[PDB]
Amino acid sequence: GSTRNGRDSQAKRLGVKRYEGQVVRAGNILVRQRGTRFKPGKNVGMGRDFTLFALVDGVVEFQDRGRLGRYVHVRPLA
Amino acid sequence: YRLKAYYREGEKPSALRRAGKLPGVMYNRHLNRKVYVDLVEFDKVFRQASIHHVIVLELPDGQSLPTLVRQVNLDKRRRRPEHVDFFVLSDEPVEMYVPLRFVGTPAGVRAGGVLQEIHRDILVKVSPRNIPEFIEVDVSGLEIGDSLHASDLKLPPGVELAVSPEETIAAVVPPEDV
Amino acid sequence: MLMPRRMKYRKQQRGRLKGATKGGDYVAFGDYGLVALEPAWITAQQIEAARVAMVRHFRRGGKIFIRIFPDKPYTKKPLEVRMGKGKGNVEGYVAVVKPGRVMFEVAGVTEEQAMEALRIAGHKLPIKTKIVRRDAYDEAQ
Amino acid sequence: MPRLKVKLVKSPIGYPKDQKAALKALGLRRLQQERVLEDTPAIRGNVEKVAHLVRVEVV
Amino acid sequence: KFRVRNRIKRTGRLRLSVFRSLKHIYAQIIDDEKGVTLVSASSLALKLKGNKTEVARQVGRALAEKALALGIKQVAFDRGPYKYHGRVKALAEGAREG
RNA sequence: GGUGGAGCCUGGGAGUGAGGGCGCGAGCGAUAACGUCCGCGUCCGAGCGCGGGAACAACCGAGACCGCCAGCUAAGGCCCC
RNA sequence: GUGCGUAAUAGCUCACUGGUCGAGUGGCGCCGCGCCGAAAAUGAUCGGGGCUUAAGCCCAGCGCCGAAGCUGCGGGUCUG
RNA sequence: GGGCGGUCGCCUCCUAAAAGGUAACGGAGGCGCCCAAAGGUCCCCUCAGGCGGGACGGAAAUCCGCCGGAGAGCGCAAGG
RNA sequence: UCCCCCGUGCCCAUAGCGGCGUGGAACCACCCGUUCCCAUUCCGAACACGGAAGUGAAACGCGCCAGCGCCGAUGGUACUGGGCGGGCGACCGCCUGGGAGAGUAGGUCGGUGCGGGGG
Numbered sequence: 037g038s039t040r041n042g043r044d045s046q047a048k049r050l051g052v053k054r055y056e057g058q059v060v061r062a063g064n065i066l067v068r069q070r071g072t073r074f075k076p077g078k079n080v081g082m083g084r085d086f087t088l089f090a091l092v093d094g095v096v097e098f099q100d101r102g103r104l105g106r107y108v109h110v111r112p113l114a
Numbered sequence: 115y116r117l118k119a120y121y122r123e124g125e126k127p128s129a130l131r132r133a134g135k136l137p138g139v140m141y142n143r144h145l146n147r148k149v150y151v152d153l154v155e156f157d158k159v160f161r162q163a164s165i166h167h168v169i170v171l172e173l174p175d176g177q178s179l180p181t182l183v184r185q186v187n188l189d190k191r192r193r194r195p196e197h198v199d200f201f202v203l204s205d206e207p208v209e210m211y212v213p214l215r216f217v218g219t220p221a222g223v224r225a226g227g228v229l230q231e232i233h234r235d236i237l238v239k240v241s242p243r244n245i246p247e248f249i250e251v252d253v254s255g256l257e258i259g260d261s262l263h264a265s266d267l268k269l270p271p272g273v274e275l276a277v278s279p280e281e282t283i284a285a286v287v288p289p290e291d292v
Numbered sequence: 293m294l295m296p297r298r299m300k301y302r303k304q305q306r307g308r309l310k311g312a313t314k315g316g317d318y319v320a321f322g323d324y325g326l327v328a329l330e331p332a333w334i335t336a337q338q339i340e341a342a343r344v345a346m347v348r349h350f351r352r353g354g355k356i357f358i359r360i361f362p363d364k365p366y367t368k369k370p371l372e373v374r375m376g377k378g379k380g381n382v383e384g385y386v387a388v389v390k391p392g393r394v395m396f397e398v399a400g401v402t403e404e405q406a407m408e409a410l411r412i413a414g415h416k417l418p419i420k421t422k423i424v425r426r427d428a429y430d431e432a433q
Numbered sequence: 434m435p436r437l438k439v440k441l442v443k444s445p446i447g448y449p450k451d452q453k454a455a456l457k458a459l460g461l462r463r464l465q466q467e468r469v470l471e472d473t474p475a476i477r478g479n480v481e482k483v484a485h486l487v488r489v490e491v492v
Numbered sequence: 493k494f495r496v497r498n499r500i501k502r503t504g505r506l507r508l509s510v511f512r513s514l515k516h517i518y519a520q521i522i523d524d525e526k527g528v529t530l531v532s533a534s535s536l537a538l539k540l541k542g543n544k545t546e547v548a549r550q551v552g553r554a555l556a557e558k559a560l561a562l563g564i565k566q567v568a569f570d571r572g573p574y575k576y577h578g579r580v581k582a583l584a585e586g587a588r589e590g
Numbered sequence: 591g592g593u594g595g596a597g598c599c600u601g602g603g604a605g606u607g608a609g610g611g612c613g614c615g616a617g618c619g620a621u622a623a624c625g626u627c628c629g630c631g632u633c634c635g636a637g638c639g640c641g642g643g644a645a646c647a648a649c650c651g652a653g654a655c656c657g658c659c660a661g662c663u664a665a666g667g668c669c670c671c
Numbered sequence: 672g673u674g675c676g677u678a679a680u681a682g683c684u685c686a687c688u689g690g691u692c693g694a695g696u697g698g699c700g701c702c703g704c705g706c707c708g709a710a711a712a713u714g715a716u717c718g719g720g721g722c723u724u725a726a727g728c729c730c731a732g733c734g735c736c737g738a739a740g741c742u743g744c745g746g747g748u749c750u751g
Numbered sequence: 752g753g754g755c756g757g758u759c760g761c762c763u764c765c766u767a768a769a770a771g772g773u774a775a776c777g778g779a780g781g782c783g784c785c786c787a788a789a790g791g792u793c794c795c796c797u798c799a800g801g802c803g804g805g806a807c808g809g810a811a812a813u814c815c816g817c818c819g820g821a822g823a824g825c826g827c828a829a830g831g
Numbered sequence: 832u833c834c835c836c837c838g839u840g841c842c843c844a845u846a847g848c849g850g851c852g853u854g855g856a857a858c859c860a861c862c863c864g865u866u867c868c869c870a871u872u873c874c875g876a877a878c879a880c881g882g883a884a885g886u887g888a889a890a891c892g893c894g895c896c897a898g899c900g901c902c903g904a905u906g907g908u909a910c911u912g913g914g915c916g917g918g919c920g921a922c923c924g925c926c927u928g929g930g931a932g933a934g935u936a937g938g939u940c941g942g943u944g945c946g947g948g949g950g
């Protein structure tokens with residue numbers, strides 16, 4: 037007659053942290069993702085927990101186009 | 115048959131459908147022209163003039179359009195039509211759903227079922243000249259166990275047959291005993 | 293009564309009752325239909341009480357059609373119990389219905405007998421349920 | 434060039450922060466207060482948001 | 493539907509493509525995400541020698557001197573359908589160095 | 591665009607961490623509670639200062655610096671109090 | 672065979688229809704306002720008196736009343 | 752309301768209102784570990800099922816061919 | 832300044848699936864062997880090597896077929912920021928913008944780069 041189950045985990049708080057059209061530095065996390073919802077393009081590196089970040093600085097761009105997954109492209113400025 | 119038409123130029127029409135003037139649109143290959151028809155004329159002819167009959171539509175340009183219905187959107191807690199999609203037929207074997215029916219003793223009338231699966235006789239495409247008004251299906255002896263239709267004896271006179279399937283057709287169900 | 297034999301989870305929520313119909317206005321099975329007009333719930337006791345009131349009314353012919361299925365567990369706490377301490381027990385599965393949805397559809401019953409039978413089963417439900425016949429208002433092209 | 438004038442005929446008391454903090458973008462603070470305004474789509478975009486509180490005339 | 497796809501990684505952005513047919517071979521050098529073939533050296537387009545595995549030395553010197561003639565040094569090497577065995581086209585000029 | 595008791599940085603100084611009503615999106619409850627707990631906003635708290643709703647904090651209008659035997663209006667009314 | 676009436680009978684009324692009459696007559700499907708359903712504990716009432724082509728209800732129109740709101744004027748304070 | 756009962760930390764899904772967060776003695780479940788390979792690099796192959804068969808064979812052991820684009824598997828509950 | 836074929840791409844099922852053609856002078860594939868460099872929990876099937884006497888059957892390209900699959904228009908609501916009301920409640924109505932998912936018509940069995948071979 038008691039409460040069977042009333043606990044819940046603390047949120048790890050994932051999500052897209054840098055959208056496109058944003059000037060970034062070398063090292064900014066583009067997206068905190070649980071699984072690899074985004075695939076690395078140019079100048080994009082993954083880590084341990086599928087987190088991809090920028091290798092250089094510039095204006096970032098998404099969706100080169102599909103059929104393999106969503107793309108992240110850190111494009112440098114010239 | 116013999117229904118009037120008008121024009122629409124991107125109006126309000128939720129405010130126009132208060133006096134029994136529901137909107138519409140007709141086409142055969144192009145010219146998606148927005149019209150509105152009258153509700154007691156369209157409803158009164160639409161009492162018996164079903165999908166099989168070619169409802170013709172007088173237009174202020176002087177043309178008589180051989181149309182039919184594509185869908186009647188039910189008002190869904192009011193039981194009314196919002197918008198009816200007309201379909202002009204052209205020189206093309208267009209698609210038709212003909213409400214055929216059943217005549218005869220169903221299953222030996224005392225030991226009879228229901229024969230409720232009408233389902234609008236799934237599809238028959240036709241030229242505009244060989245289009246029918248009524249095709250008859252008999253139910254000569256079809257008692258409870260055997261003798262089902264199975265669309266094998268579904269050869270209509272002429273044009274055309276059912277295209278892909280032969281599976282949806284009426285059958286005999288047992289009654290509700292106490 | 294009747295109940296779903298398998299579920300993913302036992303208890304679930306209530307929600308709201310808005311929306312028009314989400315399907316279920318065209319009859320497509322029988323020649324008549326008992327269509328609802330007010331949003332409420334349909335218990336399995338309301339299903340049984342309306343289903344018995346057909347087969348006991350008309351006999352030897354006419355198949356009855358039901359197009360309602362209870363998948364929502366009505367959750368009620370026991371009597372003289374304070375608030376909290378989890379949800380209550382499950383007593384009977386209810387069925388959410390929307391206005392303008394056709395619930396009961398008679399088959400093989402005539403006009404003056406189907407109006408009467410749907411009139412008898414109309415009083416077994418807490419909803420204003422009017423009666424519609426077979427019209428040309430199908431979804432065919 | 435067309436100018437724009439609005440008169441505040443209903444107070445933002447009972448209206449959210451994107452209404453009371455939207456009248457601060459125009460700078461009017463009371464009933465029966467009016468001022469000339471430019472025909473910029475930003476100010477127009479404020480005008481259709483607080484359109485249920487002011488009356489709009491084109492000068 | 494056989495494919496190995498060692499051409500999918502592309503960390504180095506400049507590769508030398510190799511195709512080995514059962515008659516002879518031919519090779520290209522592609523620039524990635526642009527779609528422009530810079531230089532190539534093809535057997536039976538220059539018809540160097542009959543034996544198919546003796547091609548790799550002369551097309552290695554030929555594609556090497558045409559690569560240095562076009563002024564590209566930092567290149568790479570694909571292994572899409574084929575093992576690094578048999579023909580090698582080994583070179584000592586250009587940054588492939590294998 | 592936006593000069594506003596708008597913002598940004600540093601330092602000093604408190605108070606608050608029992609909230610509640612209303613509309614919507616919800617959970618528990620019984621689609622019960624002026625019931626419990628969140629979010630989106632407002633109001634009361636801190637505007638029991640004003641007019642209407644007979645009287646009443648959150649329903650509506652309105653944000654009271656003071657004074658005048660001056661007008662125009664918002665909500666609500668125009669048979670008499 | 673429409674309802675009675677009979678254990679069953681018999682019988683009374685008929686669904687169907689002939690006239691001397693007489694110019695309108697029934698079933699419906701919506702829709703606005705209504706009636707019953709509607710019985711609790713000190714004295715009843717919509718605030719009260721009263722209100723029926725309204726002093727209720729629906730669509731309108733022209734005015735007026737109506738705050739410590741805004742302007743008319745005077746005076747003080749704070750900021751720039 | 753307190754006591755009795757249940758819970759006290761971490762993870763997964765929903766509630767949770769399409770950024771993030773977000774409560775209740777709200778619902779459904781797991782954990783206090785394990786792998787010298789169940790790790791790194793390099794090189795090969797694509798799964799589970801269904802159909803037609805077999806020599807035993809449960810309709811599941813092992814083998815062949817076709818269909819099968821990810822319904823299998825990824826140590827462990829759930830999600831990606 | 833063009834057609835055919837081979838590599839390598841971008842469009843992400845309008846590119847595939849299934850059926851019907853068609854091609855080897857020219858590439859490519861098939862084939863004949865394994866003798867060495869190589870390999871197979873086993874086997875030259877797949878990687879590797881000599882070839883190349885025979886072939887386009889299979890696979891591979893091009894062309895056709897809309898049903899199989901996919902894409903999918905104008906209206907019309909569902910829904911909803913925002914504002915205004917109704918119902919004792921469950922929940923509805925109007926205006927201003929926005930605007931789906933199914934379904935219907937219809938479309939398709941490809942489009943477009945770079946570098947090579949032959950005429």
Ligand SMILES: [Mg+2]
Pocket residue numbers: 446447448
């Ligand atoms: Mg207010």
Ligand SMILES: [Mg+2]
Pocket residue numbers: 493494
């Ligand atoms: Mg494949």
Ligand SMILES: [Mg+2]
Pocket residue numbers: 496497
């Ligand atoms: Mg591989």
Ligand SMILES: [Mg+2]
Pocket residue numbers: 496572573574
């Ligand atoms: Mg290979």
Ligand SMILES: [Mg+2]
Pocket residue numbers: 595
């Ligand atoms: Mg401030």
Ligand SMILES: [Mg+2]
Pocket residue numbers: 607
């Ligand atoms: Mg505290």
Ligand SMILES: [Mg+2]
Pocket residue numbers: none
């Ligand atoms: Mg607190």
Ligand SMILES: [Mg+2]
Pocket residue numbers: none
């Ligand atoms: Mg709170």
Ligand SMILES: [Mg+2]
Pocket residue numbers: 610
């Ligand atoms: Mg409270």
Ligand SMILES: [Mg+2]
Pocket residue numbers: none
């Ligand atoms: Mg409440």
Ligand SMILES: [Mg+2]
Pocket residue numbers: none
């Ligand atoms: Mg306040």
Ligand SMILES: [Mg+2]
Pocket residue numbers: 638
């Ligand atoms: Mg007081």
Ligand SMILES: [Mg+2]
Pocket residue numbers: 642
């Ligand atoms: Mg008052």
Ligand SMILES: [Mg+2]
Pocket residue numbers: 647
């Ligand atoms: Mg007050």
Ligand SMILES: [Mg+2]
Pocket residue numbers: none
């Ligand atoms: Mg003031």
Ligand SMILES: [Mg+2]
Pocket residue numbers: none
């Ligand atoms: Mg006045």
